[PDB]
Amino acid sequence: VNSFSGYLKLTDNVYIKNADIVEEAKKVKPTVVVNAANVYLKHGGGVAGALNKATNNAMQVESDDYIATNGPLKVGGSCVLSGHNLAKHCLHVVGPNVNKGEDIQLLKSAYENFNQHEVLLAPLLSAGIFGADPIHSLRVCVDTVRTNVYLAVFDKNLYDKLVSSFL
Ligand SMILES: NC(=O)Nc1ccc(C(=O)N[C@@H]2c3cccc(O)c3C[C@@H]2C(=O)O)cc1
């Protein structure tokens, strides 16, 4: 039994809710919140900008030190950093950005990172300003992630489209 409330169950392990992932992180304080990161961990906009702003820029400060030590992530890769005031940990996951021409097949590799964590609060990878089709992202998520994932979809209209079109 966990504390996520008001989710619709899609499969054995994937749940979805029309919610602001920032507000959901602040209320649940999950072990893991997933960030929709880029390889430089520059949290300027979209989910990443919203999460970083909610940490008063502490996420960005920590991220800049991480990059200075380790260099950029790979598209499809991830790193675990602090969750600050939002979660125990933040899993920064880099989905391909279609608006940069990155290979959409890397989306499955990106979701595989979720399997290293028993339970996660997460957005749909490569959705929003990353330019992929959220319905495709949801399909890859369900077909790749085996651990328990609570997806927060900010847009109500998209949310109902995702629910109404789900197989
Ligand atoms: N307090 C805050 O600013 N919160 C906050 C700000 C921005 C985002 C975001 O960019 N969402 C994205 C989006 C939008 C419209 C269609 C989408 O397919 C997506 C994917 C993303 C998602 O819904 O996961 C999420 C939360």
Swiss-Prot record:
Catalytic activity, reaction form: Thiol-dependent hydrolysis of ester, thioester, amide, peptide and isopeptide bonds formed by the C-terminal Gly of ubiquitin (a 76-residue protein attached to proteins as an intracellular targeting signal)
Identify its membrane topology class.
Answer: Multi-pass membrane protein
Subcellular localization, as worded in the UniProt entry = Host endoplasmic reticulum membrane
Regulation of its activity: Inhibited in vitro by GRL-0617.
According to its UniProt entry, the function of this protein is described as: Responsible for the cleavages located at the N-terminus of the replicase polyprotein. Participates together with nsp4 in the assembly of virally-induced cytoplasmic double-membrane vesicles necessary for viral replication. Antagonizes innate immune induction of type I interferon by blocking the phosphorylation, dimerization and subsequent nuclear translocation of host IRF3. Also prevents host NF-kappa-B signaling. In addition, PL-PRO possesses a deubiquitinating/deISGylating activity and processes both 'Lys-48'- and 'Lys-63'-linked polyubiquitin chains from cellular substrates.
Listed under subunit, the entry gives:
May form homohexamers. Interacts with N protein.
| The protein's name | Papain-like protease nsp3
The stretch of the full-length protein covered here is 1025 to 1191 of 7096
